[PDB]
Amino acid sequence: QSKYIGTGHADTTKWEWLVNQHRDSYCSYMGHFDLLNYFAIAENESKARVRFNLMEKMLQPCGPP
Template identity: 60%
Template sequence: MSSELRHTANTQTAQLHSRYTGTGHADVTKYEWLTNQHRDTSSSIVGHPALLQYLSIADGEACARMKFELTERMLQPCGPPPPKDDE
């Protein structure tokens, strides 16, 4: 691969990561990756009315209540972050 193509690919990857934070990179921790997955799933359910209605019927809740719970769950979908190892 030529240097110019490699530079273009790296630039495109950097732009993708800056635009979509959930795409990850080499230094993403397991917690961050899981958090992004859970947030993406919750936002997809909230954004698709048919999925939201299906889930609300399955849980026996109102659609507005289910939407509220999913939105609240996006704050910390996997619980509090693990302690960081400061050296």
């Protein structure tokens, strides 16, 4: 379980948990087509640019610890 990214333990901070679920969420946006469609419709941006911003968000989705 330690080798599986996203797994947690007792000494897991809240920042680690929410950066894990943030990256998971962004990857799911990349995956499910109609989700990326809804997002690309909300903010008037093409699918490519929305995926690009979602990839730039992967470095630090929330902020430094």
